[PDB]
């Protein structure tokens, strides 16, 4: 997310045993980094 020029990243890595979907259970992501980058973002694209 972007708030007032900070780009915030949260994450979680968790084991799964379901190829077909996201898990139905509960888990909370924790902050990775809080970048002061000051850009405008309206689009994005993953890198493979």
């Amino acid at each position: 997310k972007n708030i007032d020029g900070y780009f915030k990243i949260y994450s979680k890595h968790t084991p799964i045993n379901l190829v077909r979907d996201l898990p139905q259970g509960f888990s909370a992501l924790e902050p990775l980094v809080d970048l002061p980058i000051g850009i405008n973002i309206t689009r994005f694209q993953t890198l493979l």
Binding site: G5, G38, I39, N40
Partner: peptide, 24 residues
């Protein structure tokens, strides 16, 4: 602070045009 001893010449190398947006 005033900087007329450093940043004047005029010195057209100095240019102008969200919070903390770097709108280059």
């Amino acid at each position: 602070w005033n900087s007329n001893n450093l940043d004047s010449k005029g010195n057209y190398n100095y240019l102008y045009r969200k919070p903390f947006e770097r709108d280059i």
